[PDB]
């Protein structure tokens, strides 16, 4: 792990040490027991299978015991994949696998995780030392596969792809509220400002301006939500333009879907936008005097709802940062305080009261309505008249003017915010030459609420369009993969899967098209539009369905089937929100005001649904001209606590974003891909047909021999493509094979666990000479020790004793614990094995050996018949010229079909008195008896050495043998 040395103190937060990892790579884990089961609360939990029978599986939750069917059970990932950096390398790509992998890494303070193309980021809720300049330098020029998962890797590769491939780039960042989208957004942009190069109104360099654009817009665009204290309530797509080298040229920012509900309304724990509470901090009192505003925020109804102060946010310090943000962005003294006046004018707009005069509804007095007219530069007389009596002159009551004041407040704030970003863009444009650009996108991801209205439809439609942009891109990279690997695979485009849902929205006579039509008819309501929806799509459009009873609150009017799931939408109010009605008399007064800003952003003045279509189309147009890079943000919990993850919450996001979507669309083809070399090493034990010789030709024969579907895999170069549930079967058979091995090696070891007596009986006949030899003694397998004493019962032995050592129980050989599965001899017992030899002596005769080595009671018996032919009475054999020794020589063991057993070929050098050259060529064959399950070892050798002695107290011709045998060859 010397590679993590360059990361310094960021190392333990990016990748665990080889010490800590290897301890997790080898932890207690068993297949078909430790699995995933669906829970009622956490939706997915780890469990250990107790008893599976009758189609029902019984296990114990990580304590409760549950009983589910055998369709919900999901195998866990081995410890080898523990906290993996790329989940695309996992063997199991089901939901709890992806969920827990993120859960494990986040528990080890490891935020970033790769999933195919996605860069899954989890909200840390703590400070990490991983954003130091040392780390930035550590990621320069490094490819994604050459460094730990990090957000820097995405933005760096985007910059390099821009220069290498000469094509535009785009980084898409999605997620729910409080997932840290804007945090990652600023990290990416700031990164680019450091990455260089430098080309060539506003103060300072371009790097400063692009960065200083954030604290300016967040003042008017961000607010304190339940999920996040500084949450942006608007989409953003900033295009950062570069040169050919490339150097920073220019930038342009575009916003999306700013919720106007915030300025006039906030929830219970939430509050209004930051800009309001910043001015009231009295950090610079000249604003309050200019705006005619007190200190207490509770004196203004538009911002008095819910909480007024945030613990983490210092509105005093943020006010200065807000002010300084505009000065850097080249905002004149006039433009600055004009925005404050309009912001302060809205605060007075909500304090306007109205009453009835028995209805025309006349104002409840001049009060603070005069202050609002001063800041906006109005008449205060023509204002309240047009506000109550719009125009051909109509009349409104107290409830209709309380909406007009609110709607106008939303109009001012939005068109001011939109004017703000356009003024910013002006300073971000330079005459400096441009070549490519990088688009950084952050829009609130797909999300299903209990109450889904028109606002949710706009967002869920955008993400529907953005997800297809991914599915198509994935489909391209997939086709590029299968084709260049040599696999003929054809399937329809993955983006077409979402086309049906999109056509229901944007296409003519669609949900949006009907809404735009119904807004053209004044004689209408929510009922007429709802009825027109069902009459057009229910039955024709499959994605349009009946609303489901949520058995709670509230109730919707229709359902829509997206890629993430099914959403129930509430229609009440859609007609009004779409065309967005405004008091055109007051708007007319806005066009003619002393304040130039108010009259500027209200010039001209077409529906929201049609407007969003215009913005999304140019967004998709840009994106399709870029190299897409996808970043997914995940929020752990609502308690804002680091290190912990709520399973149902995380699973919701994973189903919403393209993470699980990208997995299922890749499953359609061949997801699991293994190299030929790694395939041999892993799945050879299943069937040794690969032999100890090509990987390409061997992988074919290994799979073709197995009882397997030959259509669930395709051969390539140099990789083997597998199906989804195919590789899960291979591992299932592999572990089942290992269980068979370990239990047999245990049984074979049982028979030779200690000292076992040995009886050897030989009836030989060489060159007509008859003789009989009877041997006895003991042997120990664990030590590899063998002690015997052979005694000829017919008198003097016709042949020299050292020539019978070979034919005189390799089952007492010492096998090491790592080679204990290569012990064929012990595996044959107690059934025993037939041993056959054929000894060849140079310039002499030969031996014929057939021995039955089996267990007869407590003692191991070796009964052998020997038959020698030819030879000479004056030769080395039958002449006793050989010495009394046997030295040491290894015996190479080879096992091969058929009839199981093994085969051996080894040379033997007996010593003569004068000379010392006498070669003996041995050819051995072994075969188990009485069938039964018998092991079969690989190519290994036995290290043998024999010590021959004599007993001076024995009258008969004899031989005392003491030999040591130990196996070796493999590890």
């Amino acid at each position: 792990d010397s590679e993590m040395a360059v990361f310094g103190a960021a190392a333990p937060y990016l990748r665990k040490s080889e010490k800590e990892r290897l301890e997790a790579q080898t932890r207690p884990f068993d297949l078909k027991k430790d699995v995933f089961v669906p829970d009622d609360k956490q939706e997915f939990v780890k469990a250990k299978i107790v008893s599976r029978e009758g189609g029902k599986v019984t296990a114990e939750t990580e304590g409760k015991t549950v009983t589910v069917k055998e369709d919900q059970v999901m195998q866990q990932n081995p410890p080898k994949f523990d906290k993996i950096e790329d989940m695309a390398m996992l063997t199991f790509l089901h939901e709890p696998a992806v969920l827990y992998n993120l859960k494990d890494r986040y528990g080890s303070w490891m935020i970033y995780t790769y999933s195919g193309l996605f860069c899954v980021t989890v909200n840390p809720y703590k400070w990490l030392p991983v954003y130091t300049p040392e780390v930035v330098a550590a990621y320069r020029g490094k490819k994604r596969s050459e460094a730990p998962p990090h957000i820097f890797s995405i933005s760096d590769n985007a910059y390099q792809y821009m220069l290498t491939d000469r094509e535009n780039q785009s980084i898409l960042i999605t997620g729910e509220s409080g997932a840290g989208k804007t945090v990652n957004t600023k990290r990416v942009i700031q990164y680019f400002a450091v990455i260089a190069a430098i080309g060539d109104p506003g103060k300072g360099t371009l790097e400063d301006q692009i960065i200083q654009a954030n604290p300016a817009l967040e003042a008017f665009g961000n607010a304190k939500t339940v999920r996040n204290d500084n949450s942006s309530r608007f989409g953003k797509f900033i295009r950062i333009h570069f040169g050919a080298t490339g150097k920073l040229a220019s930038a342009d920012i575009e916003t999306y879907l700013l919720e106007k509900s915030r300025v006039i309304f906030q929830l219970k724990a939430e509050r209004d936008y930051h800009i309001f509470y910043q001015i009231l901090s009295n950090k610079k009192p000249e604003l309050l005097d200019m705006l005619l505003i007190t200190n207490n925020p509770y004196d203004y109804a538009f911002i008095s709802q819910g909480e007024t102060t945030v613990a983490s946010i210092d509105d005093a310090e943020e006010l200065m940062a807000t002010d300084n943000a505009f000065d850097v962005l080249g905002f004149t003294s006039e433009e600055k305080n004009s925005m404050y006046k309009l912001t302060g004018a809205i605060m007075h707009f909500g304090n306007m009261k109205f009453k009835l005069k028995q209805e025309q509804a006349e104002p409840d007095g001049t009060e603070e309505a005069d202050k609002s007219a001063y800041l906006m530069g109005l008449n205060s007389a023509d204002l309240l008249k047009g506000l109550c009596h719009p125009r051909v002159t109509k009349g409104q009551n107290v409830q209709q003017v309380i909406y007009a004041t609110g709607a106008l407040a939303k109009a001012v704030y939005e068109r001011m915010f939109n004017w703000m970003v356009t003024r910013i863009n002006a300073t971000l444009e330079t005459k400096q030459p441009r070549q490519y650009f990088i688009g950084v996108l952050d829009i609130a991801g797909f999300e299903i609420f209990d109450f889904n209205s028109f606002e949710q439809l706009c967002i869920n439609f955008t993400n529907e369009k953005l997800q297809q942009f991914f599915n198509h891109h994935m489909f391209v990279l997939e086709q590029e993969e299968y084709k260049k690997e040599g696999i003929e695979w054809t399937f329809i485009d993955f983006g077409m899967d979402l086309q049906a849902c999109i056509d229901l929205i944007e296409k003519p006579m669609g949900i949006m098209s009907i809404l735009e039509e119904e807004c053209m008819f004044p004689k209408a309501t929510d009922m007429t539009f709802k009825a027109k929806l069902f009459d057009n799509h229910l039955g024709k459009s499959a994605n349009f369905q009946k609303p489901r009873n949520i058995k709670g609150k509230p109730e919707a009017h229709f359902s829509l089937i997206h890629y993430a799931g099914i959403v129930d939408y509430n229609i009440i109010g859609w007609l009004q929100k779409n065309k967005d009605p405004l008091n055109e008399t007051v708007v007319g007064l806005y066009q003619k005001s002393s304040l130039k800003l108010l009259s500027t952003l209200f010039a001209n003045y077409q529906t929201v649904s049609a407007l969003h279509r215009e913005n999304l189309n140019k967004l998709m147009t840009n994106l399709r001209s870029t190299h897409p890079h996808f970043v997914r943000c995940i929020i752990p919990n609502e308690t804002k606590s680091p290190g912990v993850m709520d399973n149902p919450l995380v699973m919701h996001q994973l189903r919403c974003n393209g993470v699980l979507e990208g997995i299922r669309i890749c499953r359609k083809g061949f997801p699991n891909r293994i190299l030929y070399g790694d395939f041999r090493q892993r799945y050879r034990i299943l069937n040794p047909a690969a032999i100890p010789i090509d990987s390409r030709k061997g992988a074919e024969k290994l799979l073709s021999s197995l009882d397997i579907d030959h259509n669930q895999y395709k051969f390539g170069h140099t990789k083997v493509f597998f199906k989804a549930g195919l590789l899960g079967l291979l591992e299932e058979m592999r572990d089942e094979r290992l269980s068979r091995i370990i239990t047999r090696t245990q049984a074979a070891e049982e028979l030779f666990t200690g000292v076992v007596p040995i009886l050897v009986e030989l009836d030989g006949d060489v060159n007509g000479h008859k003789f009989s030899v009877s041997g006895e003694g003991e042997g120990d397998a664990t030590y590899g020790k063998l002690t015997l004493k052979f005694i000829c019962t017919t008198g003097k032995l016709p042949v020299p004793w050292p020539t019978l050592v070979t034919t005189f129980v390799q089952c007492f050989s010492r096998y090491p614990d790592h080679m204990k599965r290569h012990d064929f001899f012990k595996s044959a017992m107690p059934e025993g094995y037939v041993q056959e030899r054929t000894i060849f002596f140079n310039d002499d005769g030969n031996y014929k050996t057939r021995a039955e080595v089996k267990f007869e009671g407590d003692t191991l018996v070796n009964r052998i018949e020997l038959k020698g032919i030819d030879f000479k009475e004056d030769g080395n054999i039958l002449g006793h010229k050989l010495e009394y020794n046997y030295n040491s020589h290894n015996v190479y063991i080879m096992a091969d079909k058929q009839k199981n057993g093994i085969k051996a070929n080894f040379k033997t050098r007996h010593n003569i008195e004068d000379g010392g050259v006498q070669l003996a060529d041995h050819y051995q064959q072994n075969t188990p008896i009485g069938n039964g399950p018998v092991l079969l070892p690989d190519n290994h050798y036995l290290s043998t050495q024999s010590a021959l002695s004599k007993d001076p107290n024995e009258k008969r011709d004899h031989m005392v043998l003491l030999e040591f045998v130990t196996a070796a060859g493999i590890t």
Side-chain angles (χ1 to χ4, degrees):
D1 59 332
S2 60
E3 297 79 2
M4 292 298 105
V6 301
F7 294 88
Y13 297 89
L14 261 57
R15 182 182 299 185
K16 295 305 175 182
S17 299
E18 60 179 5
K19 182 65 179 301
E20 297 186 10
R21 282 193 280 102
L22 192 57
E23 291 178 357
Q25 306 298 295
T26 56
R27 52 184 171 91
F29 167 79
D30 184 31
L31 198 61
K32 87 188 60 180
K33 296 192 183 303
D34 301 273
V35 293
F36 288 111
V37 293
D39 199 271
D40 302 330
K41 293 294 184 179
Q42 304 302 317
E43 196 166 2
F44 278 107
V45 285
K46 293 183 178 180
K48 195 174 187 300
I49 299 183
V50 180
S51 58
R52 180 189 66 89
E53 52 205 25
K56 304 178 301 179
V57 182
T58 302
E60 45 179 351
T61 307
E62 57 177 343
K64 299 91 178 181
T65 58
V66 296
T67 302
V68 295
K69 301 195 63 178
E70 51 188 358
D71 298 272
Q72 298 85 310
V73 282
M74 303 168 184
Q75 299 79 9
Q76 295 181 3
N77 285 323
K80 192 172 186 176
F81 306 97
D82 188 86
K83 295 187 278 75
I84 202 175
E85 297 184 337
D86 197 345
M87 293 183 299
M89 304 301 301
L90 294 177
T91 176
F92 300 138
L93 275 309
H94 44 67
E95 294 180 345
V98 180
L99 169 63
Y100 272 84
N101 188 93
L102 261 36
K103 190 176 184 180
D104 290 334
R105 300 176 106 271
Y106 189 73
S108 298
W109 315 111
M110 300 177 65
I111 295 302
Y112 308 99
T113 311
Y114 291 148
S115 185
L117 275 68
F118 292 117
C119 181
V120 183
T121 300
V122 196
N123 198 321
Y125 289 108
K126 68 175 300 180
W127 181 88
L128 306 179
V130 311
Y131 307 107
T132 56
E134 311 99 45
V135 182
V136 181
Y139 275 92
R140 305 301 293 104
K142 282 196 183 179
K143 294 302 179 178
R144 179 167 159 178
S145 176
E146 300 177 343
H150 204 288
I151 192 60
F152 289 168
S153 173
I154 297 298
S155 50
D156 195 272
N157 280 270
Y159 180 85
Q160 291 301 314
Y161 278 152
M162 180 184 61
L163 308 183
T164 304
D165 302 337
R166 270 191 171 262
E167 58 186 10
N168 303 329
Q169 306 286 320
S170 61
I171 300 178
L172 293 82
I173 306 178
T174 62
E176 295 186 1
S177 181
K181 307 184 293 87
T182 61
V183 180
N184 285 269
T185 299
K186 290 186 295 183
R187 290 190 190 278
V188 170
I189 301 177
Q190 180 198 16
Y191 191 72
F192 293 155
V194 185
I195 291 310
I198 301 166
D200 179 88
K203 301 177 180 179
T205 181
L206 182 56
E207 280 79 5
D208 300 334
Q209 299 175 353
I210 302 181
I211 297 302
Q212 206 66 23
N214 297 272
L217 295 183
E218 288 180 4
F220 293 82
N222 300 28
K224 186 255 184 177
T225 329
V226 184
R227 287 287 192 85
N228 186 17
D229 297 24
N230 196 333
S231 180
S232 295
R233 312 307 303 184
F234 66 99
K236 180 181 62 181
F237 182 71
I238 166 179
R239 304 188 306 164
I240 313 178
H241 293 264
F242 297 89
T245 31
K247 22 200 177 181
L248 193 63
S250 175
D252 50 274
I253 309 179
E254 182 167 349
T255 62
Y256 298 102
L257 302 179
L258 171 67
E259 57 175 28
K260 297 170 294 184
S261 304
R262 187 73 60 177
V263 57
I264 65 179
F265 168 76
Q266 51 270 3
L267 281 73
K268 45 201 301 179
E270 303 177 9
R271 75 172 192 171
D272 206 329
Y273 290 139
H274 295 331
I275 179 62
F276 295 93
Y277 305 94
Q278 286 175 183
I279 306 175
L280 307 187
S281 61
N282 198 86
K283 185 59 180 180
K284 40 204 305 96
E286 70 274 10
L287 296 182
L288 294 183
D289 294 327
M290 187 183 186
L291 271 52
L292 303 176
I293 300 183
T294 63
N295 199 329
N296 190 30
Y298 290 93
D299 300 332
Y300 307 94
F302 274 170
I303 65 176
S304 180
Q305 312 181 38
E307 197 172 4
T308 185
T309 55
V310 190
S312 62
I313 303 180
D314 196 333
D315 298 89
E317 306 298 328
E318 290 293 337
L319 179 63
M320 285 297 185
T322 296
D323 197 312
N324 292 328
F326 287 106
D327 287 277
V328 177
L329 286 173
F331 281 79
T332 64
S333 300
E334 296 83 303
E335 291 177 330
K336 290 172 54 181
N337 50 21
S338 295
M339 296 182 302
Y340 291 106
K341 283 185 297 182
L342 289 184
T343 304
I346 299 182
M347 297 177 55
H348 288 328
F349 226 93
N351 286 18
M352 295 184 179
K353 291 300 182 61
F354 299 93
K355 57 183 178 181
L356 298 177
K357 294 290 297 182
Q358 300 86 29
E359 290 80 351
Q360 289 76 12
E362 298 180 3
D364 205 348
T366 57
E367 47 179 353
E368 297 186 1
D370 288 335
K371 302 179 182 178
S372 179
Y374 174 78
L375 302 181
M376 289 181 176
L378 301 178
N379 296 267
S380 179
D382 299 29
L383 172 62
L384 277 66
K385 286 189 303 178
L387 198 151
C388 298
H389 295 70
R391 301 187 63 179
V392 292
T393 302
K394 272 294 183 299
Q396 296 182 342
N397 69 88
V398 58
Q399 301 175 354
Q400 297 178 231
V401 298
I402 204 177
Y403 175 84
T405 53
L408 262 299
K410 299 187 303 178
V412 173
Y413 200 94
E414 182 194 16
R415 303 176 93 90
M416 176 184 60
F417 179 84
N418 296 332
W419 167 87
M420 190 176 306
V421 306
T422 52
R423 181 62 184 91
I424 290 181
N425 287 324
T427 64
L428 295 184
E429 300 301 329
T430 56
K431 300 180 181 179
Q432 179 177 333
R434 314 176 187 181
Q435 194 68 19
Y436 341 93
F437 80 104
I438 303 180
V440 181
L441 178 68
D442 55 310
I443 306 182
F446 198 103
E447 185 176 353
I448 303 181
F449 307 90
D450 298 329
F451 177 78
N452 307 271
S453 182
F454 177 74
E455 298 84 8
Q456 283 71 14
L457 180 59
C458 302
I459 300 182
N460 295 16
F461 172 59
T462 300
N463 291 119
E464 191 78 28
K465 293 283 297 182
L466 293 179
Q467 184 58 39
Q468 172 174 333
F469 175 63
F470 170 80
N471 292 22
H472 171 56
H473 180 62
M474 175 64 67
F475 177 80
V476 170
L477 292 180
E478 286 290 343
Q479 277 190 330
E480 291 291 338
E481 182 70 18
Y482 290 104
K483 183 179 181 180
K484 299 195 64 178
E485 287 291 337
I487 287 81
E488 186 175 7
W489 169 84
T490 304
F491 200 85
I492 55 104
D493 179 77
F494 297 156
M496 295 293 101
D497 296 28
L498 282 74
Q499 261 289 348
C501 181
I502 295 183
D503 290 338
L504 179 58
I505 315 297
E506 61 178 24
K507 262 181 55 182
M509 299 305 300
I511 304 183
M512 290 302 184
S513 181
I514 294 178
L515 222 177
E516 294 174 1
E517 183 191 47
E518 200 69 20
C519 287
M520 300 296 101
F521 302 150
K523 190 73 175 183
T525 176
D526 289 324
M527 301 299 300
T528 62
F529 168 66
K530 169 185 176 300
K532 191 168 295 182
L533 284 182
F534 290 108
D535 289 24
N536 283 274
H537 297 288
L538 188 136
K540 187 177 67 183
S541 299
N543 297 91
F544 195 93
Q545 220 68 27
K546 183 187 305 301
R548 55 177 63 177
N549 295 329
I550 202 180
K551 296 293 298 181
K553 294 181 60 180
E555 179 64 30
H557 298 172
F558 73 98
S559 296
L560 219 174
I561 303 181
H562 303 275
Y563 70 96
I566 304 181
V567 183
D568 309 315
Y569 291 103
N570 183 267
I571 310 185
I572 301 299
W574 285 24
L575 281 308
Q576 191 177 28
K577 295 174 183 177
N578 187 22
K579 65 185 187 66
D580 186 30
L582 292 174
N583 196 329
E584 297 183 1
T585 58
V586 183
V587 174
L589 295 178
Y590 284 173
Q591 298 174 344
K592 298 183 179 61
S593 180
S594 61
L595 181 57
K596 196 168 187 176
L597 178 58
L598 179 65
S599 59
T600 301
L601 55 96
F602 267 107
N604 300 328
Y605 171 66
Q606 52 87 19
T607 56
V608 177
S609 62
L611 177 61
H612 177 69
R613 182 180 299 178
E614 186 181 24
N615 302 334
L616 183 55
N617 283 328
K618 68 175 300 180
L619 175 60
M620 295 299 298
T621 305
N622 276 320
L623 263 52
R624 295 186 191 96
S625 62
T626 58
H627 187 350
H629 304 285
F630 307 89
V631 174
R632 297 295 157 259
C633 297
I634 304 295
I635 168 176
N637 52 90
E638 279 75 10
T639 59
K640 299 179 180 58
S641 299
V644 286
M645 258 189 176
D646 303 343
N647 293 29
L649 178 58
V650 180
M651 278 303 307
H652 179 265
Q653 303 181 258
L654 292 177
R655 292 168 182 168
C656 281
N657 54 25
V659 174
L660 292 180
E661 171 68 22
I663 293 178
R664 73 160 193 84
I665 60 178
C666 291
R667 177 157 50 249
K668 291 187 174 184
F670 297 99
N672 293 272
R673 304 157 187 173
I674 311 181
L675 298 175
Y676 280 81
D678 294 85
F679 176 74
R680 185 206 305 181
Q681 178 185 350
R682 185 64 175 180
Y683 305 101
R684 166 175 166 81
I685 59 182
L686 211 57
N687 184 24
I691 94 180
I693 331 180
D694 182 31
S695 59
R696 220 289 184 178
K697 220 180 191 305
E700 299 176 349
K701 195 165 188 174
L702 209 164
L703 291 172
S704 302
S705 60
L706 295 174
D707 190 31
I708 200 182
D709 194 335
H710 305 279
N711 299 121
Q712 285 189 339
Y713 58 84
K714 298 296 184 300
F715 296 102
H717 43 272
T718 310
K719 212 171 305 177
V720 182
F721 287 70
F722 294 93
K723 211 61 177 59
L726 179 61
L727 192 56
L729 180 63
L730 269 58
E731 293 288 343
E732 182 179 355
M733 298 179 63
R734 184 183 183 274
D735 184 90
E736 198 274 346
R737 189 69 175 94
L738 288 177
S739 300
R740 179 181 292 102
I741 295 297
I742 186 180
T743 50
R744 192 161 295 107
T745 61
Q746 185 70 17
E749 184 180 348
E750 172 64 28
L751 303 174
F752 300 90
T753 182
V755 179
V756 178
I758 308 179
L759 270 305
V760 177
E761 189 70 21
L762 182 142
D763 287 35
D765 196 337
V766 45
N767 200 20
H769 297 267
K770 57 176 181 179
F771 63 95
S772 178
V773 179
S774 180
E776 65 171 355
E778 61 184 7
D780 197 19
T782 58
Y783 279 72
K785 185 175 183 179
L786 211 64
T787 302
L788 297 178
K789 178 184 178 181
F790 308 92
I791 297 179
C792 184
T793 60
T794 59
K796 286 291 185 177
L797 193 63
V799 287
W801 292 95
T803 60
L804 267 58
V805 179
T806 305
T807 60
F808 272 156
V809 276
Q810 293 115 335
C811 48
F812 292 89
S813 305
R814 169 180 168 83
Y815 271 84
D817 294 270
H818 67 276
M819 293 180 56
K820 198 150 56 183
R821 69 177 184 92
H822 297 268
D823 200 327
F824 157 75
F825 305 96
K826 296 190 184 59
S827 180
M829 323 308 296
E831 278 70 18
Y833 59 95
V834 177
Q835 188 179 62
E836 298 182 2
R837 282 194 176 94
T838 307
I839 311 176
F840 289 152
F841 297 94
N842 286 78
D843 305 33
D844 276 322
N846 61 274
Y847 283 161
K848 199 64 178 181
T849 297
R850 187 189 184 277
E852 291 190 2
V853 183
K854 58 183 177 182
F855 265 106
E856 294 185 355
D858 59 327
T859 72
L860 189 141
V861 183
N862 194 333
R863 297 169 63 179
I864 166 188
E865 49 180 352
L866 203 157
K867 186 178 185 61
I869 327 181
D870 297 88
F871 283 102
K872 288 296 182 179
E873 264 70 17
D874 61 328
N876 303 329
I877 300 92
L878 295 173
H880 296 66
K881 298 180 180 179
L882 301 179
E883 300 181 8
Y884 192 70
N885 56 329
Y886 197 70
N887 281 17
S888 58
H889 40 65
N890 301 330
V891 173
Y892 296 88
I893 291 184
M894 299 179 180
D896 198 90
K897 289 299 180 299
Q898 301 180 0
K899 288 187 176 182
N900 307 331
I902 61 179
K903 64 187 302 179
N905 50 328
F906 57 95
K907 52 94 183 62
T908 306
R909 295 158 294 184
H910 290 85
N911 300 121
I912 323 101
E913 184 65 26
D914 294 31
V917 181
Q918 177 70 4
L919 269 298
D921 193 26
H922 296 252
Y923 290 150
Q924 182 183 184
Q925 291 185 358
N926 295 266
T927 299
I929 319 178
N931 208 328
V934 181
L935 295 177
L936 205 62
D938 300 333
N939 294 21
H940 66 336
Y941 65 93
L942 292 180
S943 181
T944 61
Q945 46 182 352
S946 302
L948 283 68
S949 61
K950 265 295 190 301
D951 184 29
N953 298 22
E954 178 64 27
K955 190 173 185 177
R956 297 168 296 182
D957 198 340
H958 63 287
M959 173 181 61
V960 176
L961 183 57
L962 188 145
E963 69 176 24
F964 298 140
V965 185
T966 305
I970 50 184
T971 298

